């Protein structure tokens, strides 16, 4: 079912050159908020910073072990490169979503992509077709309709649900609240 309690939430969060320190700190804050509020074993979190490259900040096992976002995020070094969303999605799909790294099979396979930038790679994401690509398009490069439309290709379906155009990092708090409202029903 959807509301099976168990959730593997991968934050595939962008730290491209496009993001500036404060903005990126708000990206951190957002993840940190979810993690704080949902500090329980039901919700396993992982976070992959990405740009040109993908960078596992921490995995499900790490979360399970430490259960503190501030600790878990200590690894964050802002990369400031391109935005290889597709390669990072494939990486996540194959490498991050593993039992050995703490991905319980019965967990809801949630991949929350946080990006202000279009997918500079645009290779494939078939590897992740079954994984829930939730995507937050910050209205910097997703200000443009043409750019927004790309999100709906990356995202899981219905894209209407899974894509959130987010005019500014400022609204991460509002978005967070909305996501909590929904995710509450998944936790039950």
Swiss-Prot record:
> Subcellular localization, per the record?
Cell membrane
- Modified how: In resting T-cells, up to 40% of surface ITGAL is constitutively phosphorylated. Phosphorylation causes conformational changes needed for ligand binding and is necessary for activation by some physiological agents.
Carbohydrate-modified residues are 40
Q: In which tissues is it expressed?
A: Leukocytes.
Where does the record place a coiled coil?
none
User: Which branch of life, at top level?
Assistant: Eukaryota
Instruction: Give the family, as the similarity comment puts it.
Output: Belongs to the integrin alpha chain family.
Describe the task this protein carries out. Integrin ITGAL/ITGB2 is a receptor for ICAM1, ICAM2, ICAM3 and ICAM4. Integrin ITGAL/ITGB2 is a receptor for F11R. Integrin ITGAL/ITGB2 is a receptor for the secreted form of ubiquitin-like protein ISG15; the interaction is mediated by ITGAL. Involved in a variety of immune phenomena including leukocyte-endothelial cell interaction, cytotoxic T-cell mediated killing, and antibody dependent killing by granulocytes and monocytes. Contributes to natural killer cell cytotoxicity. Involved in leukocyte adhesion and transmigration of leukocytes including T-cells and neutrophils.
Question: What is the protein named?
Answer: Integrin alpha-L
- Could you tell me the gene encoding this protein? ITGAL
């Amino acid at each position: 079912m959807a509301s099976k309690g168990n959730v593997d939430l991968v934050f595939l969060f962008d730290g491209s050159m496009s993001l500036q320190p404060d903005e990126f700190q708000k990206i951190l804050d957002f993840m940190k908020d979810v993690m704080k509020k949902l500090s329980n074993t039901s919700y396993q979190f992982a976070a992959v910073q990405f740009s040109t490259s993908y960078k596992t900040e921490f995995d499900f096992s790490d979360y399970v072990k430490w259960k503190d976002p501030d600790a878990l995020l200590k690894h964050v070094k802002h990369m400031l490169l391109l935005t290889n969303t597709f390669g990072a999605i494939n990486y996540v799909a194959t490498e991050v979503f593993r039992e050995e790294l703490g991905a319980r099979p019965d967990a809801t396979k949630v991949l929350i992509i946080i990006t202000d930038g279009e997918a500079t790679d645009s290779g494939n994401i078939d590897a992740a077709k079954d994984i829930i690509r939730y995507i937050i398009g910050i209205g910097k490069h997703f200000q443009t309709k043409e750019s927004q439309e790309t999100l709906h290709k990356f995202a899981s379906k219905p894209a209407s649900e899974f894509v959130k155009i987010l005019d500014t990092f400022e609204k991460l708090k509002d978005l967070f609240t909305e996501l909590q409202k929904k995710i509450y029903v998944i936790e039950g």
